[PDB]
Amino acid sequence: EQLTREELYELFDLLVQVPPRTYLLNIWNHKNGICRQGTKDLLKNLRGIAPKPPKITWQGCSYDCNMMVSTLETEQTNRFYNLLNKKAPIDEIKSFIRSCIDEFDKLHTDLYVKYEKIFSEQKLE
Amino acid sequence: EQLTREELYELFDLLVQVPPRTYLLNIWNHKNGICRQGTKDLLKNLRGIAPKSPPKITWQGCSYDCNMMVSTLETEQTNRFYNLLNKKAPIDEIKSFIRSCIDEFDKLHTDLYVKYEKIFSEQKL
Ligand SMILES: [Hg+2]
């Protein structure tokens, strides 16, 4: 039952107090599902404009993108558990989760911009 | 003074509660300055590749199109910003919005560059 981003942010107002940790972990799994669908969408969009100067291949783009997103996911999850363990207020936790999603959106933007330029230049000459 | 992108992102993490309107307007003006420098950089780069049946695309046309696209996006984003202010959006939502507007401008700048790179390349034969 994957929550949409909209449903997650609405649910972030039903949390006026810090909920139990199981609840918090459930929310983080929905966060992961949202970011991972963003990655799937990025790779789908990049595959569309990849060709069939630099000599970057689809396999290279895919390795780079997957390494950046997988490393970001690990780093964010670690920051999440540290927030939990230090018993942070609910407002801080909510801002942290929304900021992690924003950070993934910026990474997906950075990757799209980077490869849009390379692929478009390869399609030339 | 004009904040760098990195300085603006730093401020975002220091808005933890909802700040006065003057502060948010000030942040928006720095956002505008960052996106306008991105537009200046785009036109500089495009000048490098500009020339020196259907009509030939010239520097004038390229410049008119780019400035219309970025100026209209500026207007539309500012109108969405004022909507959030007036509806008293919580700070996490405003922060996501401003971050997303900068991503949208980065994408537009890249889309424009790729568009003209292709057009100027094809004409050159
Ligand atoms: Hg460029």
Side-chain angles (χ1 to χ4, degrees), chain A residues 2-51 53-54 56-58 60-124, chain B residues 2-16 18-51 54-86 88-124:
Chain A
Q2 166 71 49
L3 303 185
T4 63
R5 204 183 289 213
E6 190 175 339
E7 280 160 351
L8 187 73
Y9 296 159
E10 295 162 342
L11 187 67
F12 278 2
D13 308 336
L14 313 172
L15 305 170
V16 278
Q17 308 186 314
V18 183
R21 152 183 286 250
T22 292
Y23 198 157
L24 287 178
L25 298 167
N26 187 278
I27 285 155
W28 192 247
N29 290 338
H30 290 293
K31 174 264 183 187
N32 281 333
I34 287 156
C35 297
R36 289 167 183 169
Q37 183 64 57
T39 298
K40 288 199 46 148
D41 290 347
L42 165 76
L43 291 177
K44 186 178 175 74
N45 303 334
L46 282 188
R47 186 71 261 211
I49 68 185
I56 192 42
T57 66
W58 173 255
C61 162
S62 179
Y63 166 96
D64 183 52
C65 291
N66 284 303
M67 190 68 35
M68 291 303 291
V69 300
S70 73
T71 302
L72 181 56
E73 183 177 298
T74 298
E75 171 213 298
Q76 289 186 348
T77 292
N78 290 341
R79 287 162 52 212
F80 180 63
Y81 273 95
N82 292 5
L83 219 49
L84 294 197
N85 294 338
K86 79 164 192 207
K87 315 295 309 262
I90 189 53
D91 278 359
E92 180 169 5
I93 292 169
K94 296 193 291 207
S95 304
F96 164 84
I97 296 170
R98 183 144 198 177
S99 280
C100 283
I101 292 168
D102 296 336
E103 185 177 15
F104 249 99
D105 289 346
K106 167 135 183 70
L107 172 61
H108 288 151
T109 300
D110 285 357
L111 289 169
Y112 194 79
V113 159
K114 174 164 77 190
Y115 285 100
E116 196 188 353
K117 287 189 258 229
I118 305 165
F119 287 158
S120 309
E121 164 177 22
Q122 277 175 337
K123 288 182 280 177
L124 269 38
Chain B
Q2 168 65 53
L3 296 180
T4 77
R5 197 182 273 247
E6 291 61 44
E7 289 168 326
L8 192 52
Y9 287 147
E10 182 181 356
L11 285 188
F12 288 159
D13 299 308
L14 304 172
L15 317 164
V16 305
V18 61
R21 195 173 254 250
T22 288
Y23 198 162
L24 295 172
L25 288 174
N26 175 276
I27 281 166
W28 193 245
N29 284 334
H30 290 297
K31 174 265 174 186
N32 278 335
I34 290 166
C35 297
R36 286 173 196 161
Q37 185 62 55
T39 297
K40 299 181 183 178
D41 292 344
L42 166 68
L43 294 173
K44 183 167 68 165
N45 294 339
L46 280 186
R47 265 182 208 281
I49 64 178
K56 287 286 174 160
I57 303 309
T58 65
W59 174 253
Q60 273 109 321
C62 166
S63 177
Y64 195 93
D65 180 59
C66 290
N67 280 300
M68 187 70 36
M69 293 299 294
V70 305
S71 75
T72 51
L73 176 59
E74 187 177 305
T75 291
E76 193 270 326
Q77 288 182 344
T78 292
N79 289 348
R80 274 192 277 150
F81 180 61
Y82 277 104
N83 281 340
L84 285 178
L85 295 187
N86 297 335
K88 298 180 269 66
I91 189 59
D92 289 342
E93 184 181 354
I94 291 159
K95 293 198 307 176
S96 292
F97 165 82
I98 300 177
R99 286 163 172 152
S100 82
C101 284
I102 294 170
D103 293 345
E104 199 184 356
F105 255 107
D106 292 347
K107 285 207 175 207
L108 173 64
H109 284 151
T110 301
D111 290 342
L112 289 169
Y113 183 78
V114 156
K115 176 165 102 206
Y116 281 104
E117 187 173 49
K118 179 178 182 302
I119 285 167
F120 288 142
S121 183
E122 295 165 337
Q123 283 187 159
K124 211 154 68 187

